[PDB]
């Protein structure tokens, strides 16, 4: 089926530049407008800017006009778009939205892409520290000091709560007699038990 | 965050609740007790950086001291009434003694 | 991180804060607000420096700090602890100061009279 | 209190001597020999004459917003041309004068007899 | 005590040092002068 | 240019309820709004273009009706699937722009917190640092604060609130409150409590010692 | 002890300054002959 | 302070042109 | 009225009130009574020795027996440090200095030209 | 920067009750929040700052709480002067940002709206212009919309959606629906209807002869 | 009472430039720091710039720099606000806002003035076309055909519904037998009795 | 406002809308949208040009209308009602061009002759 | 909005709802009927900008119509084989008189 | 009808006319050198 | 149509180069 | 028609003037 | 029908000749003296010749999907290299003959005569 | 099969259908019967006259009798405008008129060459 | 009416070709015997 | 006790310079 596909979750130490791949697949690549949308600030999406695959051209968002710079590439059917000097508020989740060739039809974007989650940040893969929470029965696990966010904190191999950050390492507070923590951020694997 | 400074047996102490990292300036000496530095006698004028670091109740909130001394035991008043004729009778005299050298070539 | 410098003309005291070079800065003295439309005259502030007339040691000598505008005064890490003792025509020079003063006016009288001596011949 | 309201703080970090009437008034005017020497200044209620060795002499009087302070006669004696005549100051000054006249003596000598 | 004042007085006495022994220069050259 | 906004950032409806969602313009965007549906994973569809066109593949039970500035996206039939984020965006002038979005949560029995305090860790002890923690737990509706107690004092300073959506199999909210202290402040206290308010302040507590 | 240093530098001025003057009463008195030789 | 090290500069300064005065004599007379 | 009458010589320092030309004598320094009983008390004036900056330096009160010190009309506030053979050179006192200086040396150049002159 | 948005753009409550409006940041704004109020006419006025320090002069029936991200605004025993717009400040970091606003209506007391048609006036068709209007009038609440009919065929082309804010003595709503039509159009068909759902569709029509 | 209080409603063409007054009384003017704010696009309140009347610095955010300049007339106590050439966008309701002077006290405004409206278009203050509306009983009032916004239509010398604007003049609807619509734009006082 | 420019050489038809200088444009053709990928490989519009190879009168003329990217098609008022009748080597030229071309032609031919008279002597 | 072009008895014709204004090109005649406005022949290549104003479905929508013939009549088919042969011969002739008159000089 | 093809004709006719004048003021050149 | 007129200008300008011709011819002989 | 009788006028201005220049040449001798 | 699937659109307002192929098919090919000319170009199901007065000469097949049509024989005569033998022309062609091998030969005669 | 021969003369124009060599004629113009009874039919081929372009140009079909037109195997599009003594100028035509002239025009300079020489 | 024209058009054409054709066969000639005198 | 050393100390070479400098014009002559 028709479908819009995104490179994945990238680290970008504040001044650099990044660079971000949708690759379309299932229909045919230059016969339509792809947008890029930003989704910062929580949920507040912003309409970054279109690229005309077929001629190359490019329209963009008076705001975004210094910070990103389409490209594509037609050969692989893959769509850019490179981040210039990311500060911290350049975190966010970016979508590239397919839309139609013609004024006629390109102001709706029927087809959208996974996302792309870009963490603006001055930090290194710290392994976790693991506590025990004790007083069914109300039992918690909390883990803390890991940077990237991907983390899977099960129970016996139940509120997985958000990660956090107050410092610059995240923390997940979970919920419930052994705890287990994969961190596939810095490859920890840490199991505890919960006795008083 | 204010890190204390503290002035006892006329030399100047900088105190903090945790070690006390040199910047710039006055090096001072490590006192027996960590965490404070002496720069010195008040009158020397000290003047330095230093950085002390995160209390219990401030957590990693470094802060940054520039202690800075002027008690100057070299200071001079000057009356210019005073350096002006001084600087003008030199000024005479070194005239008489040129016309001295120009009469004698 | 860029230091407080610290300049002493006499009765005046002249602070000034390099580390904010954009944005207007403010002062703070002892957690008090100081700079801007106040009963005193003798203190004010423009640019990056504050103008500290009729200095005195027992009043106006503790912490000081600069923030720009947008910045709360409590937010601060760079305090000076300026404690000084000033007088009226006041100056600090030392023993090699002077030897250069004597030093430098023997050899101008020196080249005047060697100068005068090679023009008469 | 006696109407005594001017007193002193001396003995500063700063060698200086101030003057304090004590009266939290506007107006606060000083008197010399009789006449205001000058209205307070804004905001301060201390006169200051200046440095300590300067020695101020003279009859000064205070008045705020009530009647003038009974004045206070301060004498003041920070001696700075000073000078101990002990044997060895004079003897030394003495050696310097007959030195002094002795080579202008010697000189004039000599100019006297070449011309 | 305060070194202010005793040092400007070190520092005009020093002044006059250096006037005293120009002024002794100046009346010996120019006394070599009226013999020559 | 042409803000959009839209009337509430959330509305709750129970199971096989019509709810309608509203979206107004800056200006008159002359019927060019689409309606867009993001999953809370993170996807997102597009719902209805043109104010009224379904789009295709995506069930008639959503509508989108409005003229001028005032439009409104109508779901009937709410099932679980349709508990989302729901955009609507203009296309009249460019920039293209989208409103807040409305996250859907389906309604359930008022019920109350069971508030859970935990002394910190062992470890956390010898590491030097003391995270107390709170576990408030399904307690719909969402109206709830955390008033943090030490020794009889409040204290409001370190405070992480952690909060989560709407569970897929109770539609219940779970909190988590931490205090982060140093093992210095954990032991120059012994009473340690934290307050909940499900809409009356339930209590729970722990000693040091 | 500093007061010390402060009169014997005081009455130090004074003498140089006296001398001074002795030096420039020369200098008029000898000044006057040498015109008058030249 | 300034010290009495402040009479002692021009005192040395004039002790070396005395020396170099008295060794110019030496070396005129005789030598 | 008329300001106290205040003469210091050396070391020692004397002090006389003309307030009241012929009354009861009774002397207070920083508040405290002074004089009477080296340091004493004249019938008129107020004899002190060994005057020091720190043992005495303060408000001093002239008032006649059976009063308090607001009574007596000004406060006297005198510091001072004393030495030995020690005298303040006013400028006339200066110029004296000068004048004879000069006078005495032009005399003995002139007395030594004439001598040598023959 | 740090966008600071509010949970409801509108909400209701009948004199006497206490209401809470919430504020959401973007970042942790450590306690920097102002509430503003917003009288129709225009004047606003700052009523608590630093989340919870009432403004001099600003009566004690408003309250601040709030701490990190969420924040709230208690209004207690609402009167008829306490019916404005309430915005929500930031002072962590500059700029600062305000939210949307949230605008206080009193609860009726649902009614009915009273459908009026009027032909175009006598001297609209001498200038050539036809403009056929609806008066919708006094029905809380404010969910209506207005349907045009031109001889049982609709008509979305040339609105005017022009509505009152409540009233201070019935808090009622009324509307105005104007449809622009010229002098030839007017004449070419004959039943002109305009359709009202007050939450069914209430109907009242004319007839050009 | 302390007191700000601006300048008035101004009709400015396009491109132009006008500047904005608002007189402070009743205070210190120096004192205090002077917000400007923007309420725009029905309710958004936007923060454009401060400025220090003491030292006349002037702060800025950073999407209004280069539309206000901020000068201030310490003699009048007045304050000003200049746009730059201003375009459709800049049409809103400007307030001035005191706060306090240093960092402690200036990120929250305790007194507001009354606004001023700017309304760049680009039209000429046409006169009322008035219409009577017929079948207690409803009948109407429309008037049309008015640029400038201010109007008062009352009713036999009801509900006022807001003006509106789909071409470039303005209508308000009066509802309730005499109408009455003055005219304080052009100058026009136009009576008009409801019969069938 | 700026007017359409129509270029035709031989059968091929370029066509440029100069209005939107900025923005990328759009065109589109009797209410069909022309240009960009399509299976028509005659045309193809780059910058603010449509070229139409391969111009069919009966089939390639009629209206013509260019708007920019962010604007719909609809809300356009500058047509362009082209209709040209195309053929290969095709020119246009009236009796005063072949008449300046004759015209010259005599005078390049006698300033050769005059030329070669003069350099020979 | 498309303003009509109609070409009958083989003279265009810009019809519209209102009075066409002229803005630049062939001016053409006012017929008898306003609104309607003939542009000559259809082979006199008519060219030009015309403005017709909004109807009674389209209110103050001006639209502009640049109506731009190419039919022409003087349109000559170029074979670029005799084009060059005959001015590869034009100049063979004038090189052979050229050659002429140098030998007469 | 149509009237590309004879108006090239026409060009043709005319650039042969040109050329057969030019011919001809050759050849009679030519003829008069050949006297002279 | 490029008309018969095209056949006329060469003759009209080698009309004129004849009466240029004939008019020199004429002022040569006699006149 | 008309190109008929610019054929035959062009023989006989042609005939003409190759007359006229060899007479031309004639008489100059 | 009878496998006549060729026919011809003329009198076009542009001078041409265009033959249509009564199939929409892919790769309908003509054929040309028994073997095929060509493949059909995409999406376009016409073979167009040329402009009409080119006079195209032969025998032409076509072949979509199916079998082949039955093949259509179009003969031209657009005759462009036509001229009347009527009494002007031959007359006025041979008055000119006449007059320019007059000229020459008495050119020649000239030459001759003078070498 | 041997597609259909035809001849133009002036204004005639005369076909034939070598695909019979021997059979019944008959002749169809635009899918309609023509031929046969100026215009008329042979028994082998067709004898056109008065052809026009408007009036007679199209298919043509040579069939025997009692077949419709799909049988007959090639239909035949003419089309042509005649003009009065007109003919098609071939390649070798125009090359015979050039070499004719060429040889004339040298043979008559070379025999008045030789006339004048003497 | 314009076929006409084509074929007196197309007729001056070939005859005036050869025309040139005469005229470049005699330019040989002469060619030839001016070279011989020359 | 230090300056005053200093003066008798210059005092001390004044004299010994202004004899030495007297004494080598002596010389010089
Ligand atoms: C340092 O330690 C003392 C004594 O424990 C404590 O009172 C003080 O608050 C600490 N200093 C800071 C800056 O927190
Ligand atoms: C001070 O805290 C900082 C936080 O960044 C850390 O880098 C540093 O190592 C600490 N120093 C000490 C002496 O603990
Ligand atoms: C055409 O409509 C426009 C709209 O501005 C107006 O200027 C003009 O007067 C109208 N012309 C006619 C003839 O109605």
């Known amino acids: 089926e028709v479908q819009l596909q995104q490179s994945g979750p990238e680290l970008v130490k504040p001044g650099a530049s990044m660079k971000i791949s949708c690759?379309?697949?299932?229909?045919?690549?230059?016969?339509?407008?792809?947008?890029?949308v930003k989704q910062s600030h929580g949920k507040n999406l912003e309409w970054?800017?279109?690229?005309?695959?077929?001629?190359?051209?490019?329209?963009?968002?008076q705001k975004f006009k210094d910070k990103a710079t389409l490209t594509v590439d037609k050969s692989s059917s893959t769509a850019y778009m490179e981040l210039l000097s990311l500060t911290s508020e350049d975190s966010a989740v970016?979508?590239?939205?397919?839309?139609?060739?013609?004024?006629?039809?390109?102001?709706?974007?029927?087809?959208?892409?996974?996302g792309t989650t870009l963490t603006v940040f001055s930090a290194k893969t710290t392994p976790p520290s693991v506590y025990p929470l004790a007083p069914m029965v109300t039992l918690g696990c909390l883990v803390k000091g890991y940077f990237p966010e991907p983390v899977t904190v099960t129970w016996n191999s139940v509120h997985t709560f958000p990660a956090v950050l107050k410092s610059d390492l995240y923390t997940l507070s979970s919920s419930v007699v052994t705890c287990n923590v994969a961190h596939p951020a810095s490859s920890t694997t840490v199991d505890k038990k919960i006795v008083p | 965050f204010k890190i204390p400074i503290e002035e006892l047996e006329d030399r100047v102490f900088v105190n903090c609740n945790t070690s006390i990292t040199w910047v710039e300036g006055t090096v001072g000496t490590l006192l027996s007790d960590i965490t404070r530095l002496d720069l010195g006698k008040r009158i020397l004028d000290p003047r330095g950086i230093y950085r002390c670091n995160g209390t219990d109740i401030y957590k990693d909130k470094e802060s940054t001291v520039q202690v800075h001394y002027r008690m100057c035991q070299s200071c001079v008043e000057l009356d210019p009434a005073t350096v002006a004729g001084i600087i003008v009778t030199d000024v005479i005299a070194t005239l008489l003694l040129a016309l001295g050298v120009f009469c004698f070539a | 991180q860029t230091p407080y410098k610290v300049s002493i003309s006499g009765t005046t005291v002249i602070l000034t804060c390099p580390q904010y070079p954009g944005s207007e800065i403010l002062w703070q003295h002892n957690d008090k607000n100081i700079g801007g439309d106040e009963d005193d005259k003798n203190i004010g502030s423009d640019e990056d420096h504050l103008s500290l007339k009729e200095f005195s040691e027992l009043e106006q000598s503790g912490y000081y700090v600069c923030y720009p505008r947008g910045s709360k005064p409590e937010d601060a890490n760079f305090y000076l602890y300026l404690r000084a003792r000033v007088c009226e025509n006041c100056m600090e020079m030392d023993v090699m100061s002077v030897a250069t003063i004597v030093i430098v006016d023997i050899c101008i009288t020196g080249g005047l009279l060697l100068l005068v001596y090679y023009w008469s011949k | 209190k006696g109407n005594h309201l001017v007193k002193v703080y001396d003995y500063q970090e700063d060698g200086s001597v101030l003057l304090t009437c004590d009266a939290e008034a506007k107006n606060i005017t000083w008197f010399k020999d009789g006449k205001m020497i000058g209205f307070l200044t804004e905001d301060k209620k201390k006169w200051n004459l200046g440095s300590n060795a300067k020695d101020p002499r003279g009859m000064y009087q205070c008045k705020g917003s009530q009647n003038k302070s009974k004045p206070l006669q301060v004498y003041y004696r920070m001696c700075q041309n000073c000078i101990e005549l002990n044997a060895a100051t004079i003897s030394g000054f003495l050696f310097a004068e007959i030195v002094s006249i002795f080579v202008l003596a010697v000189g004039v000598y000599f100019i006297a007899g070449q011309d | 005590v305060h070194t202010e004042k005793v040092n400007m007085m070190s520092l005009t006495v020093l002044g006059l040092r250096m006037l005293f022994a120009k002024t002794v220069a100046v009346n010996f050259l120019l006394t070599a002068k009226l013999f020559f | 240019d042409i803000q959009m906004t839209q009337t509430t950032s959330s509305l709750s409806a129970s199971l096989g309820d019509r709810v309608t969602i509203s979206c107004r313009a800056s200006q008159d965007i002359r019927n060019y709004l689409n309606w867009y549906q993001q999953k809370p994973d993170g996807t997102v569809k597009l719902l209805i273009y043109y104010t009224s066109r379904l789009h295709s593949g995506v069930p008639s039970k959503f509508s989108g009706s409005g003229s001028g500035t005032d439009y409104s996206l109508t779901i009937s039939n709410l099932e679980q699937e349709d508990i989302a984020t729901y955009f609507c965006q203009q296309g009249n002038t460019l920039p293209w722009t989208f409103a807040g979005g409305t996250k859907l949560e389906i309604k359930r029995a008022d019920a109350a917190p069971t508030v859970s305090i935990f002394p910190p860790a062992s470890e956390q002890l010898t590491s030097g640092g003391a995270s107390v923690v709170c576990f408030l737990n399904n307690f719909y509706p969402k109206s709830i604060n955390s008033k943090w107690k030490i020794d009889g004092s409040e204290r409001q300073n370190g405070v992480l609130n952690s909060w989560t959506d709407q569970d897929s199999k109770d539609s219940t909210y779970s909190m988590s409150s931490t205090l982060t202290l140093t093992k210095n402040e954990y032991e120059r206290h012994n009473s340690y409590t934290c307050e909940a308010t499900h809409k009356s302040p339930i209590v729970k507590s722990f000693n040091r010692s | 002890d500093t007061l010390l240093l402060q009169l014997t530098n005081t009455s130090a001025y004074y003498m140089y300054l006296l001398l001074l003057l002795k030096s420039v009463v020369y200098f008029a008195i000898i000044t006057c002959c040498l015109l008058r030789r030249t | 302070l300034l010290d009495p090290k402040l009479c002692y500069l021009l005192d040395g300064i004039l002790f070396i042109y005395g020396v170099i005065l008295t060794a110019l004599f030496l070396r005129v007379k005789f030598s | 009225q008329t300001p106290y009458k205040v003469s210091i010589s050396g070391t020692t320092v004397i002090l006389t009130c003309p307030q009241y030309p012929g009354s009861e004598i009774l002397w207070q320094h920083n508040d405290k009574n002074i004089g009477g009983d080296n340091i004493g008390s004249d019938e008129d004036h107020l004899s002190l020795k060994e005057f020091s900056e720190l043992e005495q330096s303060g408000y001093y009160v002239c008032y006649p027996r059976g009063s308090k010190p607001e009574d007596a009309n000004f406060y006297l506030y005198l510091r001072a440090r004393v030495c030995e053979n020690c005298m303040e050179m006013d400028v006339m006192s200066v110029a004296t200095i000068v004048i004879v200086d000069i006078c005495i040396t032009g005399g003995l150049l002139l007395l030594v030209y004439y001598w040598s002159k023959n | 920067d740090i966008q600071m948005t509010q949970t409801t753009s509108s909400l209701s409550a009948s004199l006497g009750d206490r209401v809470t409006i919430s504020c959401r940041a973007s970042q942790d704004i450590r306690n920097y929040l102002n509430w503003y109020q917003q009288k129709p006419d225009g004047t606003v006025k700052l009523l608590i700052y630093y989340t919870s320090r009432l403004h001099s002069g600003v009566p004690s029936k408003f309250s601040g709480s709030g701490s990190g991200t969420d924040y709230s605004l208690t209004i207690s025993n609402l009167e008829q002067e306490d019916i404005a717009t309430y915005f929500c400040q930031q002072g962590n970091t500059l700029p600062w940002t305000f939210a949307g606003g949230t605008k206080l209506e009193i609860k009726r007391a649902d009614a009915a709206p009273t459908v009026s048609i009027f032909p175009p006036a006598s001297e609209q068709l001498t200038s050539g212009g036809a403009s056929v209007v609806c008066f919708l009038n006094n029905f809380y609440p404010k969910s209506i919309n207005s349907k045009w009919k031109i001889d049982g065929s609709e008509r979305q082309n040339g609105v005017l959606n022009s509505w009152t804010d409540q009233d201070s003595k019935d808090s009622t709503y009324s509307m105005s629906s104007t449809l622009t039509l010229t002098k030839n159009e007017y004449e070419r068909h004959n039943s002109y209807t305009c359709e009202a759902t007050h939450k069914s569709p209430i109907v009242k029509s004319f007839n050009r002869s | 009472e302390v007191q700000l209080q601006q300048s008035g409603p101004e009709l400015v063409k396009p491109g132009a430039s006008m500047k904005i007054s608002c007189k402070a009384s009743?205070?210190?003017?120096?004192?205090?720091?002077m917000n400007w704010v923007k309420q725009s696009h029905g309710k958004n309140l936007e923060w454009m710039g401060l400025?220090?009347?003491?030292?006349?610095?002037?702060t800025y955010n950073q999407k209004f720099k280069d539309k206000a300049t901020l000068t201030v007339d310490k003699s009048s106590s007045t304050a000003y606000m200049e746009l730059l050439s201003l375009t459709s966008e800049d049409s809103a309701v400007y307030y001035c806002?005191?706060?306090?002077?240093?960092?402690?006290?200036?990120?929250?405004?305790?007194?507001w003035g009354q606004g001023t409206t700017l309304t760049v278009f680009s039209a000429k203050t046409t006169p009322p076309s008035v219409y009577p509306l017929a079948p207690m009983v409803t009948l109407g009032c429309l008037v049309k055909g008015y640029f400038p916004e201010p109007v008062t239509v009352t009713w036999n010398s009801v509900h006022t519904f807001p003006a509106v604007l789909k071409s470039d003049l303005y209508t308000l609807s009066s509802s309730v037998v005499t109408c009455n619509v003055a005219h304080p734009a052009s100058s026009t006082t136009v009576d008009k009795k409801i019969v069938p | 406002q700026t007017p359409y420019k129509v270029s035709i050489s031989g059968t091929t038809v370029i066509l440029t809308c100069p209005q939107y200088p900025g923005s990328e444009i759009l065109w589109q053709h009797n209410d069909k949208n022309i240009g960009g990928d399509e299976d028509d490989k005659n045309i193809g519009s780059d910058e603010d040009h449509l070229s139409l190879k391969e111009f069919s009168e009966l089939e390639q003329s009629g209206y013509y209308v260019c708007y920019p990217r962010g604007s719909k098609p609809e809300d356009a008022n500058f047509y362009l009602y082209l209709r040209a009748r195309v053929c290969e080597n095709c020119m246009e030229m009236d009796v005063m061009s072949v008449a300046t071309i004759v015209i010259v032609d005599i005078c390049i031919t006698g300033g050769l002759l005059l030329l070669v008279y003069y350099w020979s002597k | 909005f498309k303003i009509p072009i109609e070409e009958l008895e083989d003279r265009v014709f810009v019809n519209c709802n209102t009075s066409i204004t002229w803005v630049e090109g062939t001016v053409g005649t006012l017929l008898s009927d306003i609104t309607r406005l003939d542009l000559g022949k259809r082979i006199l290549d008519p060219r030009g900008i015309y403005r017709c104003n909004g109807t009674d479905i389209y209110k103050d929508k001006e639209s502009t119509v640049q109506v731009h013939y190419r039919m022409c009549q003087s349109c000559v088919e170029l074979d670029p084989a005799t084009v060059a042969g005959i001015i590869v011969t034009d100049v063979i002739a004038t090189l052979l008189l050229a050659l002429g008159v140098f030998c007469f000089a | 009808v149509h009237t590309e093809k004879v108006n090239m004709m026409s060009l043709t006719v005319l650039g042969l006319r040109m050329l057969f004048a030019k011919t001809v003021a050759v050849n009679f050149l030519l003829t008069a050198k050949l006297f002279f | 149509l490029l008309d018969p007129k095209l056949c006329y200008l060469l003759d009209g300008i080698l009309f004129i180069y004849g009466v240029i011709l004939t008019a020199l011819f004429l002022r040569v002989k006699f006149s | 028609l008309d190109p008929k009788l610019c054929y035959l006028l062009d023989g006989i201005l042609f005939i003409y003037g190759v007359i006229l220049t060899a007479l031309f040449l004639r008489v100059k001798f | 029908k009878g496998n006549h699937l060729v026919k011809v659109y003329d009198y076009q307002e542009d001078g041409s000749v265009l033959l249509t192929c009564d199939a929409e098919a892919k790769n309908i090919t003509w054929f040309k003296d028994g073997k095929m000319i060509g493949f059909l170009t995409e999406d376009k199901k016409k073979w167009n010749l040329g402009s009409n007065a080119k006079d195209p000469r032969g025998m032409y097949q076509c072949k979509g999907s199916q079998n082949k049509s039955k093949p259509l024989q179009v003969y031209y005569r657009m005759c462009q290299n036509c001229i009347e033998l009527n009494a002007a022309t031959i007359s006025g062609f041979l008055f000119a003959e006449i007059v320019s091998i007059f000229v020459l030969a008495v050119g020649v005669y000239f030459i001759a005569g003078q070498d | 099969q041997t597609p259909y021969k035809v001849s133009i003369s002036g204004t005639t124009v005369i076909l034939t259908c070598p695909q019979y060599p021997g059979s019944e004629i008959l002749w169809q113009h635009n899918d309609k019967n023509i031929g046969g009874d100026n215009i008329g039919s042979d028994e082998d081929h067709l004898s056109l006259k008065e052809f026009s372009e408007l009036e007679q140009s199209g298919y043509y079909v040579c069939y025997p009798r009692g077949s419709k037109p799909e049988d007959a195997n090639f239909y035949l599009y003419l089309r042509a405008r005649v003009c009065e003594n007109c003919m098609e100028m071939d390649v070798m035509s125009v090359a015979t008129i050039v070499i004719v002239d060429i040889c004339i025009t040298g043979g008559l300079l070379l025999l008045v060459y030789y006339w004048s020489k003497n | 009416d314009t076929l006409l024209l084509q074929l007196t058009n197309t007729s001056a054409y070939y005859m005036y070709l050869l025309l040139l054709l005469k005229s470049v066969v005699y330019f040989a000639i002469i060619t030839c015997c001016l070279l011989r005198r020359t | 006790l230090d300056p005053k050393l200093c003066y008798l100390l210059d005092g001390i070479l004044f004299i010994y310079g202004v004899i030495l400098t007297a004494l080598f014009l002596r010389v010089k002559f």
């Open positions: 806002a005191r706060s306090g002077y240093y960092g402690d006290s200036d990120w929250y405004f305790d007194v």
């Open positions: 400025i220090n009347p003491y030292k006349g610095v002037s």
């Open positions: 009743g205070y210190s003017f120096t004192g205090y720091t």
